[PDB]
From a paper:
ClpC1 is an ATP-dependent homohexamer that is responsible for substrate recognition and unfolding. The essential ClpC1–ClpP1–ClpP2 proteasome complex of Mtb has recently become the focus of several drug-discovery campaigns. The NTD (amino acids 1–145) has been studied extensively to determine the most critical residues for the binding of ClpC1 to several natural cyclopeptides with potent anti-TB activity.
Excluding the four N-terminal residues, the r.m.s.d.s between these two apo structures and that with bound ECU (chain W) are 0.43 and 0.68 Å, respectively, explaining the importance of these structures in solving the large asymmetric unit of the ClpC1-NTD–ECU complex. The region consistently has higher B factors and was more challenging to refine, with unusual orientations of residues. This may reflect the true nature of the protein itself; the mobility of this loop may allow the domain movements that are observed between structures.
Residue numbers in the entry: 1 to 152
């Protein structure tokens, strides 16, 4: 499905699989996409969360506290959960609502919040990372970057 994904956004979903592997989970949940997103660290999604005053280390610690560590590291491909698949479906819907013709890390963060049930949504809203607030923060951050770039 990942044809519309930017290099950074594909980097997030590859990192989600490796986050599951290292915690000994044989699934990729909303929790592993959120960890892949903060692991990437550089994209509009990580910057959007930091610009709301949220600690990325603090996000990792909150997620890891909830999900714990499985018993046996799995082998090869790790299957997405249906709600993780829903995050990725909603990332596309959020890109269309912003009039973007790409799926960036910022659309994955919106997808994670909009899924509204998982470990990712629970941690994020608890930190004040609500959907309409983050949509506006992503638009404003993109606008702010394009104005700064315009200086060089």
């Amino acid at each position: 499905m990942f044809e519309r994904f930017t290099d950074r956004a594909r980097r997030v979903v590859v990192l989600a699989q490796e986050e599951a592997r290292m915690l000994n989970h044989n699934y990729i949940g909303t929790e592993h996409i959120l960890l892949g997103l903060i692991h990437e660290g550089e994209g509009v999604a990580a910057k959007s969360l930091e610009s709301l005053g949220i600690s990325l280390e603090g996000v990792r610690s909150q997620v890891e506290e909830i999900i714990g560590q499985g018993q046996q590291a799995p082998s090869g491909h790790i299957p997405f959960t249906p709600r993780a698949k829903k995050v990725l479906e909603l990332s596309l819907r959020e890109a269309l609502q912003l009039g973007h013709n790409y799926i960036g890390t910022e659309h994955i963060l919106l997808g994670l919040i909009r899924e509204g049930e998982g470990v990712a949504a629970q941690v994020l809203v608890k930190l004040g990372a609500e959907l309409t607030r983050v949509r506006q923060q992503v638009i404003q951050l993109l606008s702010g970057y394009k104005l700064a770039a315009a200086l060089e």
